[PDB]
Amino acid sequence: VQMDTEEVREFVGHLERFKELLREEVNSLSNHFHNLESWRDARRDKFSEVLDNLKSTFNEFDEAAQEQIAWLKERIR
């Protein structure tokens, strides 16, 4: 066999935990932020967006990670 399936299984598991953790952590952070009633200048607005470009980047990572996980699981046979 070429690939080492045990090594690959372990990485897949880790990729899975990492991508579930980050989505839950960024939702958490975002729900907290948008729930601040008293910070509402143009700075809050500048961060709202910085948070949004983080959220977009994670979900693109998420999508790319899911497709790699699929390929690797297939390779495993």
CA atoms within 13 A on the CB side of 28: 6
Greatest distance between any 2 Cα atoms in the chain = 60
Strands (E) located in the chain: none
CA atoms within 13 A on the CB side of 32: 7
Declared resolution, Å = 2.1
Instruction: Please state, in angstroms and rounded to a whole number, the distance separating the CA atoms of residues 35 and 19.
Output: 24
User: Of 22, 5, 13, 26, nearest to 62 (Cα)?
Assistant: 22
Experimentally, how was this structure solved? X-ray
Q: Which domains are assigned to the chain?
A: 1-77 (1.10.287.850)
